[PDB]
Amino acid sequence: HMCDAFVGTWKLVSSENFDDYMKEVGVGFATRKVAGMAKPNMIISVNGDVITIKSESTFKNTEISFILGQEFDEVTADDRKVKSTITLDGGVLVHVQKWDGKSTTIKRKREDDKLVVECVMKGVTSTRVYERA
Numbered sequence: 001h002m003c004d005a006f007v008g009t010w011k012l013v014s015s016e017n018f019d020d021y022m023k024e025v026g027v028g029f030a031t032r033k034v035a036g037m038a039k040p041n042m043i044i045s046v047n048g049d050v051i052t053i054k055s056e057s058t059f060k061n062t063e064i065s066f067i068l069g070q071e072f073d074e075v076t077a078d079d080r081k082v083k084s085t086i087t088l089d090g091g092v093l094v095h096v097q098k099w100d101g102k103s104t105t106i107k108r109k110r111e112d113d114k115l116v117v118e119c120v121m122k123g124v125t126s127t128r129v130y131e132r133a
């Protein structure tokens with residue numbers, strides 16, 4: 001029952017500062033433009049100890065499956081090859097990606113009827129809000 005309130009199909013409804021987050025990450029111009037247009041659906045499911053988070057969009061589709069606290073390989077939508085670890089901290093999913101000596105953290109939280117995704121690269125934060133699809 002760990003992540004019950006995250007499970008479901010979610011649609012992006014707002015974004016703030018994502019272009020500046022992507023710049024800080026190192027994403028190039030053309031990818032930022034096309035990635036910034038996308039309105040993804042995020043599909044979260046749980047089977048036993050395995051959590052799956054899928055993103056379906058016109059830009060890229062991504063999918064990760066993982067066990068909390070257990071590092072895995074991830075290919076991001078912008079084609080970084082990163083080493084990821086996801087934990088639950090006080091009801092918040094905390095996703096840390098490491099690559100080329102860099103790090104970025106993505107937090108996913110339930111707030112009212114929304115799922116809020118906060119992405120931080122150094123001093124730059126983007127907030128992306130999802131509602132049930």
Ligand SMILES: O=C1NC(=O)N2[C@@H]1CS[C@@H]2c1ccc(Cl)c(Cl)c1
Nearest residue numbers: 022025027035055077078117119128
């Ligand atoms: O809303 C989201 N759901 C995800 O998996 N996303 C966004 C924020 S962080 C990650 C992403 C997507 C595209 C690019 Cl280009 C980058 Cl750098 C990061």
